[PDB]
Amino acid sequence: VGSLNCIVAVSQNMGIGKNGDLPWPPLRNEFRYFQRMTTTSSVEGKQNLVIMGKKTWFSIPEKNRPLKGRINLVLSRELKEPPQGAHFLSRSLDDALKLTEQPELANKVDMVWIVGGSSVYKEAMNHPGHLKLFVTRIMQDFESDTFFPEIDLEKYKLLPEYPGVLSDVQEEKGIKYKFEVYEKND
Numbered sequence: 771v772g773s774l775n776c777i778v779a780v781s782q783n784m785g786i787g788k789n790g791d792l793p794w795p796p797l798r799n800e801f802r803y804f805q806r807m808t809t810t811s812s813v814e815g816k817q818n819l820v821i822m823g824k825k826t827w828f829s830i831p832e833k834n835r836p837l838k839g840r841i842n843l844v845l846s847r848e849l850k851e852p853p854q855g856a857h858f859l860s861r862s863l864d865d866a867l868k869l870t871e872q873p874e875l876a877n878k879v880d881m882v883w884i885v886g887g888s889s890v891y892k893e894a895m896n897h898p899g900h901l902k903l904f905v906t907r908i909m910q911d912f913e914s915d916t917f918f919p920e921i922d923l924e925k926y927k928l929l930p931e932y933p934g935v936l937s938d939v940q941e942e943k944g945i946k947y948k949f950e951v952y953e954k955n956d
């Protein structure tokens with residue numbers, strides 16, 4: 771099984787969501803980027819796994835439910851089975867990652883991507899070991915009600931570039947944003 775990775779898009783005031791939707795209007799290529807990063811597996815005959823909280827699952831426009839080409843796992847202590855269209859259900863992040871070692875997934879999974887929400891991000895980021903964060907910096911303030919955790923830069927190093935990730939400023943709908951990759955190993 772491969773790398774552990776978080777991916778997020780976040781505004782200047784640290785916001786990731788407002789009532790189960792994005793703080794900002796739809797950014798079509800930003801979303802294509804998320805799709806490409808999380809889907810693309812190098813290891814042949816494997817798929818990436820995506821791990822999200824229950825809220826995040828239910829915020830997915832149904833058109834993208836499940837996220838195609840990836841194994842979709844939802845985290846919920848309340849649910850008793852994977853939601854309609856999801857593949858797996860775990861009661862915690864540690865369980866999710868363990869499940870990954872079992873024979874049913876042992877060599878189906880390439881990369882695992884945590885795609886939200888706030889408490890999942892915080893736990894993966896605080897989890898010792900080798901981890902990357904793919905962070906789109908939306909370079910405005912947007913009114914939000916859910917927030918990305920603090921990135922501890924003593925631990926997380928911003929990489930000066932990364933294959934397959936544009937290093938320069940993007941703009942959609944008059945909103946500027948840029949793509950960053952942070953890496954820790956502790």
Ligand SMILES: NC(=O)C1=CN([C@@H]2O[C@H](COP(=O)(O)OP(=O)(O)OC[C@H]3O[C@@H](n4cnc5c(N)ncnc54)[C@H](OP(=O)(O)O)[C@@H]3O)[C@@H](O)[C@H]2O)C=CC1
Binds near residue numbers: 791792826888
């Ligand atoms: N990059 C971006 O801009 C992103 C934005 N979002 C947005 O934020 C929202 C979703 O984020 P958020 O509200 O933080 O919620 P989550 O997606 O984390 O969902 C929360 C629920 O999932 C369960 N859960 C969370 N963590 C764990 C865990 N470790 N183990 C077991 N269960 C867990 C709990 O469900 P239960 O009560 O059933 O146990 C919890 O109430 C949406 O608005 C979405 O649009 C989400 C991801 C990325």
Ligand SMILES: CC[C@@H](C)/C(=C\c1coc2nc(N)nc(N)c12)c1ccccc1OC
Binds near residue numbers: 778800830
């Ligand atoms: C897992 C859900 C994903 C489909 C999503 C957000 C992102 C999660 O990590 C992300 N990382 C990046 N770089 N961009 C994103 N957009 C997300 C999303 C959630 C609610 C409403 C609209 C959304 O996208 C239009």
